[PDB]
Design an enzyme around this catalytic site. Structure first.
Site, PDB file in Angstrom:
ATOM      1  N   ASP A 127      33.948  -8.043  33.035  1.00 31.35           N
ATOM      2  CA  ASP A 127      33.109  -7.935  34.220  1.00 31.35           C
ATOM      3  C   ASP A 127      31.868  -8.806  34.022  1.00 31.35           C
ATOM      4  OD1 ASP A 127      31.578  -6.459  32.413  1.00 31.35           O
ATOM      5  OD2 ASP A 127      31.915  -4.552  33.398  1.00 31.35           O
TER       6      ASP A 127
ATOM      7  N   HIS B 225      38.229 -21.283  20.453  1.00 34.10           N
ATOM      8  CA  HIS B 225      38.041 -22.084  19.246  1.00 34.10           C
ATOM      9  C   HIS B 225      39.097 -23.188  19.123  1.00 34.10           C
ATOM     10  CE1 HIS B 225      34.988 -19.906  16.490  1.00 34.10           C
ATOM     11  NE2 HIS B 225      34.652 -19.763  17.758  1.00 34.10           N
TER      12      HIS B 225
ATOM     13  N   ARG C  53      38.851 -15.542  21.712  1.00 37.64           N
ATOM     14  CA  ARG C  53      38.053 -16.309  20.760  1.00 37.64           C
ATOM     15  C   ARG C  53      38.914 -17.386  20.100  1.00 37.64           C
ATOM     16  NH1 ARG C  53      36.704 -14.515  14.703  1.00 37.64           N
ATOM     17  NH2 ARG C  53      35.796 -16.521  14.065  1.00 37.64           N
TER      18      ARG C  53
ATOM     19  N   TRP D  27      28.467  -7.052  23.106  1.00 35.78           N
ATOM     20  CA  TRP D  27      27.445  -7.475  24.058  1.00 35.78           C
ATOM     21  C   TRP D  27      27.303  -6.480  25.205  1.00 35.78           C
ATOM     22  CZ3 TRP D  27      30.523 -10.478  21.185  1.00 35.78           C
ATOM     23  CH2 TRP D  27      29.966 -11.597  20.538  1.00 35.78           C
TER      24      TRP D  27
ATOM     25  N   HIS E  45      31.608 -13.333  26.623  1.00 37.52           N
ATOM     26  CA  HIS E  45      31.144 -12.310  25.689  1.00 37.52           C
ATOM     27  C   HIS E  45      31.175 -10.907  26.289  1.00 37.52           C
ATOM     28  CE1 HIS E  45      29.028 -15.550  23.074  1.00 37.52           C
ATOM     29  NE2 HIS E  45      30.260 -15.334  22.745  1.00 37.52           N
TER      30      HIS E  45
ATOM     31  N   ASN F 247      31.137  -1.886  27.353  1.00 37.97           N
ATOM     32  CA  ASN F 247      32.549  -1.814  27.710  1.00 37.97           C
ATOM     33  C   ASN F 247      33.239  -3.111  27.261  1.00 37.97           C
ATOM     34  OD1 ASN F 247      31.108  -3.351  29.569  1.00 37.97           O
ATOM     35  ND2 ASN F 247      32.234  -2.620  31.370  1.00 37.97           N
TER      36      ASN F 247
ATOM     37  N   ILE G 110      36.612  -4.459  28.906  1.00 36.28           N
ATOM     38  CA  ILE G 110      36.635  -4.621  30.346  1.00 36.28           C
ATOM     39  C   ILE G 110      35.900  -5.917  30.691  1.00 36.28           C
ATOM     40  CG2 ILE G 110      35.877  -3.679  32.556  1.00 36.28           C
ATOM     41  CD1 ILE G 110      38.197  -2.207  31.410  1.00 36.28           C
TER      42      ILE G 110
ATOM     43  N   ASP H 291      22.658 -16.816  23.280  1.00 38.08           N
ATOM     44  CA  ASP H 291      22.753 -16.046  24.519  1.00 38.08           C
ATOM     45  C   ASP H 291      21.381 -16.036  25.176  1.00 38.08           C
ATOM     46  OD1 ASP H 291      25.507 -15.152  24.205  1.00 38.08           O
ATOM     47  OD2 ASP H 291      24.813 -13.620  22.836  1.00 38.08           O
TER      48      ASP H 291
END
Ligand code: HEM
Ligand code: HEM
Ligand SMILES: [K+]
Ligand SMILES: [K+]
Lengths: 249, 249
Positions: free
Chosen positions: B186, B41, B37, B178, B162, B181, B184, B207
């Site tokens: 993915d 940013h 993040r 979100w 996210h 996990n 992780i 989103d």
């Protein structure tokens, strides 16, 4: 290794995918130390006298997991299986060694080169090839040198693997971490040895022997003073350890 | 960027060492989401038109950290400072982008290429250039396309970031991860969106806007259908984001 096998495009992609999966999983679960110990115990049973043992997927076997030195590795095996199951193309031999290389990388260690192609052998090697923590120099040269075929320098560099992790009474009989930052891979293991024993940290008879040897001693001092040298020599030693008995040698 | 700057052999060596240091620290602390993040940013402030803002180390400045949208980033800046001090020759611009790349790698994400050479700038950009989570399509294209110069594909791949991390009520008003996990990396972010809103997991208006756009929707299904496709596109979008206004483009 000398003449590395040519792996299929699918095998190669399998390896590249497993590496990424292992990184996130190991990082999240904070089990790098145990996974490096698993890779080391898998590779360290190679005996040049008979050309048996070595990094060939046998450690997951009940017979081999029963070895006194392998106490607690069953959890390492059980931990990785879920990931292994997503990759039936990859051999356990390659898989465990890839996990070991990732364990070093995630903790901030050097990037050890990896080469796939190891095959899974059916029978586990006999017990007693792995080093006894209660012994010293003589023993270390017999195990790493005579049996494995590694150099004195390799012995010292690989002992630095203790920079991460800790001993557990119920597994080995000893307890405590070797360093103050058991999840960071650095040269602090050598400094602790040089500053003598202290309550909160662990020092095994095998670690201390590095201090009284004419060859080992000056290397322990170099590594403590220069981390970059430790890292380059460690990468060299880990690479060879992982390919013991593989791809020609 | 298109024409990468020549940096000294010492500078490249420092970058490689910093990468290894960032890996261990980020993994041990479990702060990868926060680190990404920060990097995002730092770069997302670029305005191609005026040729201002962008990944040029200004986020460490008090005035920029005071931007409401940068709520909590002060903590990330402090967490990394001790590592930055070990590498004084590396600019904060490069440092923060390198840290963002590492965050993606250790969570299991793709390997985004890194090129050193960003210079630190004394003047941070004005407030208001970063996306607002309460808006949708028009705003997203207004920010990413018009201002930054990224494509519609980039917008959807980047939103995939996210997949790791969570919202914190005391930072943006929203709360929750979100995916089930958050550590992780993915393509679970996309499958979560396609399967509607669930109790526990978070879905922002920005989103949701991806689901109601002619161009965005197909990309969401594309990435939800194939993680390899997602990884290739994300790595590409991330590389572009990290280099906005650097080395020409
Ligand atoms: C040189 C002789 C060596 C001996 C006798 C030895 C002995 C030990 C002992 C007794 C343990 C078990 C701790 C427990 O109870 O869980 C241990 C742990 C460990 N050793 Fe070694 N070791 C040696 C070499 C190495 C090498 C070559 C490496 C790899 C580079 C290594 C990596 C590890 C790691 C990472 C742990 C920590 C595991 C954990 O945190 O659970 N060791 N070692
Ligand atoms: C498309 C517009 C986007 C908007 C408006 C948006 C908005 C937000 C908001 C409100 C939060 C919650 C912050 C908090 O309270 O901690 C958040 C967190 C986060 N976002 Fe975004 N985001 C966007 C794009 C991206 C991009 C491009 C990336 C990076 C590739 C990204 C990565 C993250 C991460 C990793 C977190 C978790 C932070 C943590 O766990 O501390 N976001 N985002
Ligand atoms: K350590
Ligand atoms: K996820």
């Amino acid at each position: 290794g000398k003449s590395y096998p040519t792996v299929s495009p699918d095998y190669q992609k399998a390896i590249e995918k497993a590496k990424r999966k292992l990184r996130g999983f190991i990082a999240e679960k904070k089990c790098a130390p145990l996974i490096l110990r698993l890779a080391w115990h898998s590779a360290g049973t190679f005996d040049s006298k008979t050309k048996t043992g070595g990094p060939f997927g046998t450690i997951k076997h009940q017979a081999e997991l029963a070895h006194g030195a392998n106490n607690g590795l069953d959890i390492a095996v059980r931990l990785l299986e879920p990931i292994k199951e997503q990759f039936p193309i990859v051999s356990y031999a390659d898989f465990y060694q890839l996990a070991g290389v990732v364990a070093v990388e995630i903790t901030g260690g050097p990037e050890v080169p990896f080469h796939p192609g190891r095959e899974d052998k059916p029978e586990p090697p006999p017990e007693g090839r792995l080093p006894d923590a209660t012994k010293g120099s003589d023993h270390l040269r017999d195990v790493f040198g005579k049996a494995m075929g590694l150099s004195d320098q390799d012995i010292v560099a690989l002992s630095g693997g203790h920079t991460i992790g800790a001993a557990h009474k119920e597994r080995s009989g000893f307890e405590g971490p070797w360093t103050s930052n058991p999840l960071i891979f650095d040269n602090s293991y050598f400094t602790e040895l040089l500053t003598g024993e202290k309550d909160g940290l662990l020092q095994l008879p095998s670690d201390k022997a590095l201090l009284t040897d004419s060859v080992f001693r000056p290397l322990v001092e170099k590594y403590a003073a220069d981390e970059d040298v430790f890292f380059a020599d460690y990468a060299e030693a880990h690479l060879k350890l992982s390919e013991l008995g593989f791809a020609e040698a």
